[PDB]
Amino acid sequence: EVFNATRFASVYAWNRKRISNCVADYSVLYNSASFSTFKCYGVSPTKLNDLCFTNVYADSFVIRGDEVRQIAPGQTGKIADYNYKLPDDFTGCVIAWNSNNLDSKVGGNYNYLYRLFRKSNLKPFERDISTEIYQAGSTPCNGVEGFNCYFPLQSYGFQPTNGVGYQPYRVVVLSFELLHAPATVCGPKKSTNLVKNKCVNFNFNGLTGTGVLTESNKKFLPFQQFGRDIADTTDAVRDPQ
Amino acid sequence: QCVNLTTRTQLPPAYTNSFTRGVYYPDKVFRSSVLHSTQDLFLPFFSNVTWFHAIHVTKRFDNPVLPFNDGVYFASTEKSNIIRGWIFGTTLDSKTQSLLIVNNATNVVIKVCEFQFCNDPFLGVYYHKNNKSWMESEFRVYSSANNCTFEYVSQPFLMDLEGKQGNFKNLREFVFKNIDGYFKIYSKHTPINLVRDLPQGFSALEPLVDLPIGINITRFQTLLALHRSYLTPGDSSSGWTAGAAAYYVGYLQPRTFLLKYNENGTITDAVD
Amino acid sequence: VQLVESGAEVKKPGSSVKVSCKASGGTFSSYAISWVRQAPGQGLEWMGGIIPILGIANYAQKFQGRVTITADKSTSTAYMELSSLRSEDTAVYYCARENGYSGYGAAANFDLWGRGTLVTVSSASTKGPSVFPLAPSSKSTSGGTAALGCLVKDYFPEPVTVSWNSGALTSGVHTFPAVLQSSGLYSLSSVVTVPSSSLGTQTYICNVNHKPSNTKVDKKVEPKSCD
Amino acid sequence: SVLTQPPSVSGAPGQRVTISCTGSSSNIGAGYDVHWYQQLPGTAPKLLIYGNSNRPSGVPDRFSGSKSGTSASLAITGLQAEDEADYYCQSYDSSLSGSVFGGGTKLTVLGQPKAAPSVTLFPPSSEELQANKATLVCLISDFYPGAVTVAWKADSSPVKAGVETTTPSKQSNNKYAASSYLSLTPEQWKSHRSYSCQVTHEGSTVEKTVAPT
Amino acid sequence: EVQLVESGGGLIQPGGSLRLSCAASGLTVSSNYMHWVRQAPGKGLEWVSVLYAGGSAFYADSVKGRFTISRNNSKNTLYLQMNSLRAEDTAIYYCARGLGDYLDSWGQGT
Amino acid sequence: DIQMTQSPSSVSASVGDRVTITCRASQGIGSWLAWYQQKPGKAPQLLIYAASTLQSGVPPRFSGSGSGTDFTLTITSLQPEDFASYYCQQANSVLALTFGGGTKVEIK
Ligand SMILES: *[C@@H]1O[C@H](CO)[C@@H](O)[C@H](O)[C@H]1NC(C)=O
Ligand SMILES: *[C@@H]1O[C@H](CO)[C@@H](O)[C@H](O)[C@H]1NC(C)=O
Ligand SMILES: *[C@@H]1O[C@H](CO)[C@@H](O)[C@H](O)[C@H]1NC(C)=O
Ligand SMILES: *[C@@H]1O[C@H](CO)[C@@H](O)[C@H](O)[C@H]1NC(C)=O
Ligand SMILES: *[C@@H]1O[C@H](CO)[C@@H](O)[C@H](O)[C@H]1NC(C)=O
Ligand SMILES: *[C@@H]1O[C@H](CO)[C@@H](O)[C@H](O)[C@H]1NC(C)=O
Ligand SMILES: *[C@@H]1O[C@H](CO)[C@@H](O)[C@H](O)[C@H]1NC(C)=O
């Protein structure tokens, strides 16, 4: 519902979505063979499925191909200072892909706008939607469209005849935030195939024991997971598959 | 919303003796043909327990806010499903996280919010003139809630809305515990044909519902549901029929218990 | 400033409804213009918004490509168009004005609101209303007071300005609303309280005016002779 | 929709009533704030609160709201007679990519001296028989909007066709009045012996029977 | 109604430092974009640097180094500092202001 | 990365003629081109912007039309007052201006 979306939000009015109460894997996302921007700092793709955070956010805004690099925190420009500001200690990265098929018609696609004029530096993780008339002269502007009074929002020309660097790219940015609260969303763990009748070790949610796995004839009550004996040693464990 | 009631003649509670009741599973391990001793909270054998009467034929309604210590034992000889659920809390003034249990006719709802609590919340069941059955239409448990992040729905169950005055046919047991902050619920259905003086038979209680809620619940209150038939005028002031119900409130104590396990893997006998 | 909209409109189930929302006391400045509907017994839905300073529109996912919304900077008015009308669409519309801000929230809040346009759909065409007198009986007049009035049948639409003696009577006059029927017909009622001593010297008449139908009938009311 | 609101609320003139609007994490649980709107029954809706902390001009100080987690709450210092209006919560939805309003709640604080239902029955006149239609009007006055069900009988079988109910209109002395209609035909009008209108109100029933002949 | 005054140009050694001065009468320096366009004598125009409304500045590939822009809001003037110079720096300039993707106003040259 | 090349350099036309000056770009740019007129010894002045719009002070004798790659600055009537060079300027996402060559118009 975020990637394969029917419509895409504007640059200034980027949609924010929070996902939780589930698990999220990045292996299928990596092997899609359609994303040309996956440079990430701080975390690693190999260790992304091991550690996790309290919550994961998602941001949706479509830009050109020249501004996908501008989303890095150490960047300046009309997008990196007036549209989206990323902190230096930001955890996560930016996912972008080519969207030549969509977000374009026969004529100029003027359905997307972005901020162009601002009197102050934007705060990190802040979105501004202002429809006030921008002023540059000393005389105040009472909402008129005269000299030194222009709309801050500038239209984007998403023509199909533009170059690769000017092609509109659909950009989805994930946000990783870890707090002291217990984690609600994490990564799914591995599920290796069991090996019976062989001296193997396992991690069955409560122990790390080495031994063969033999089929038994005693059945468990449907509320127990462990199993003891006379000598108080674990020798009967239920496989949750 | 909630309403107040009027003073009437009531029956004081009596004291009865328990006979090998209040024994559950203290762990989730499998033990076969062994005798394992464990230290946890269990109901002492042959201990004095209170008796609360809810039968109509009079007008016995006694739901006081009993304190909740480290473990209780709620046993009801339920026949026509008069007792529906329980409400837990600490101060009951929309200040702490309060717990609500309701076994409705469609699904079991376990929501933990600051629901507020009146002096006597209850469920009213009204008898329709056109339909020859009982439908619950008076939903008076809470007024409003502000926030809560915990919302759990258990498995659906089928409840009988018809109330009678005959002998009981089933026995229900409920055990509420609070260790580390986790909530423990032990329940099992056992069929028996008796009114009082429960038999000396043994029946363990398996855990059913387990929830990680940060509550303190120093006190608790049970719910009693009455019936609105053509005999009563229809006002919850002085005339109501509560069917035939009788529930016991036990207190768990930190007593060492020896549990006997069979080859199948169920508890057969217990020794204090 | 204040915004003005069009009046009440009635159409056919399958025509196109055309409304506008004008601005009085000033233009729209650079703030965006949006439209929010409201149905009786339901919530308020958002269908789209117009950027009047750039001439672009942003619709909603619920509404498909059947509605085009435009704005004209020359006359400073909002231009709304809806097609493929349905019997469900019996809601009223207001024109919303949004006032944004800079902050963490960045949620659009509707600052100014329009008067409101009443739009309803009816398959039945315009017909001629029929008015018949109502008079009390002998058993109904137990005391010194009597109840009488006039009844309106097969009329459209429901809002009808009913006056007694061309507005000369104001005490005891009650106005009743219409009600749905199986065929979609509407029916109102009107009753007044008059003493029995004035029934033999004063004649009560009902004046019903229908502005869309361009008709006005005058009818007299007489007491029953059998009872 | 995606926003859940209570259907109705109750209160007293002098106590505190808190209305909570909860929604999904995409709109309410995200970084977007909430905006409150008040719509009186008869006038256009108007802005009440934006930004969850600020207030507009002309809005009384008794209107205050708070945001906590995945819900929005309001604090009201006393209920007045003009507070009888619908309440909605509006927030930006990321999945919808547009504004979405709440389910709406009704805050009704009123009280009237309800009395016994006085009903009247007006038989149709002789001039109505030539219109190939027969209507029966059962006007009821000095009654409460609750228990407004109207039943029609012909002393042998109840009538289940052409029956309806009407929303009463407020009078000038804190009273509500309504009427009911029954569509019949002049051919079967003279077949039955008598007609009556039955109105049930809080257990009190009044029967009025008219004689066509 | 837009007027820009430029000064500070003259003869200087390549191994020296000079400070340029661009002033606007009816415009401020902290609310609009400004372009530093240098045109070679006998050749076409060429972009060198740009200053945003905030505290961000950009330079071209050939003039990425040895360039510093520091606007002053006290006297409504624009300051540019050149630590080092090359033999190709002999060109005319017009300090100017403009919007995104284009500029309209211009100024004089020294 | 982007190079702005103009095909004409010196074109001579009479008063009743169209100068037909065109500009070319390596990468397609959609309606974000501006044209200027720099008199000798005088500051340049903007003539058109975004390849479609006209400035208020600029007389309407100038025109432009180009979607992505081929642009033009055809003039209906050539005036002796405006005899100077022209430049096609296209900016980038970082406000990096790119000025092309100059085309001069001379009297035959
Ligand atoms: C999204 O859409 C593409 C093409 O329509 C499809 O190949 C893919 O499976 C969809 N889902 C995801 C998660 O990419
Ligand atoms: C786990 O998921 C698999 C899906 O292939 C399913 O076949 C299996 O029954 C599941 N195990 C459960 C529900 O215990
Ligand atoms: C239990 O309660 C009864 C009252 O019914 C009392 O007679 C008896 O002494 C009590 N026994 C104990 C051990 O407290
Ligand atoms: C049963 O009760 C629960 C809470 O008491 C409620 O959520 C649910 O909707 C009720 N079911 C019906 C069918 O009313
Ligand atoms: C519960 O009560 C105990 C003792 O009264 C106290 O130490 C503890 O902090 C309380 N916990 C909460 C969550 O109120
Ligand atoms: C437990 O399982 C054993 C082995 O199948 C069986 O003989 C025994 O009857 C079972 N116990 C019960 C109570 O059914
Ligand atoms: C819920 O609201 C109450 C105020 O009614 C507040 O004290 C509490 O902190 C809130 N809970 C959360 C999780 O924000």
Residue numbers in the entry:
A (entry chain A): 340 to 580
B (entry chain B): 14 to 70, 76 to 290
C (entry chain D): 2 to 228
D (entry chain E): 2 to 214
E (entry chain F): 1 to 110
F (entry chain J): 1 to 108
From the manuscript:
SARS-CoV-2 Omicron variants feature highly mutated spike proteins with extraordinary abilities in evading antibodies isolated earlier in the pandemic. Investigation of memory B cells from patients primarily with breakthrough infections with the Delta variant enables isolation of a number of neutralizing antibodies cross-reactive to heterologous variants of concern (VOCs) including Omicron variants (BA.1-BA.4). YB9-258 and YB13-292 demonstrate best cross-neutralization abilities towards VOCs, including the Omicron BA.1 variant. RBD substitutions in Kappa (L452R, E484Q) and Lambda (L452Q, F490S) variants abolish YB13-292 binding. To understand neutralizing activities of cross-neutralizing antibodies identified by our activity assays we determined the cryo-EM structures of the most potent YB9-258 and YB13-292 antibodies in complex with various spikes proteins.
Probably similar to other 3 RBD “up” spike structures previously characterized, this structure is highly labile and we observed many antibody bound S1 particles likely derived from disintegrated spikes. In this epitope, residue 417 is centrally located while residues 484, 452 and 490 are outside of the epitope. Although K417N only mildly affects YB9-258 binding but its effect is the strongest among common RBD single substitutions we tested. Consistently, YB9-258 exhibits reduced binding to RBDs of Beta and Omicron BA.1 variants both containing the K417N substitution, while RBDs with E484K/Q, L452R and F490S substitutions have little effect on YB9-258 binding. HCDRs and LCDRs of YB9-258 bury 694.9 A2 and 533.5 A2 of RBD surface areas respectively. Residues in CDRs mediate extensive contacts with the epitope, among these many are extra or altered hydrophobic residues introduced by somatic hypermutations. These include F27L in HCDR1, S53A and Y58F in HCDR2, S30G in LCDR1, and F94V, P95L in LCDR3. In contrast, the P95L change introduced by SHM in YB9-258 LCDR3 hinders K417 to form cation-π interactions with Y33 and Y52.
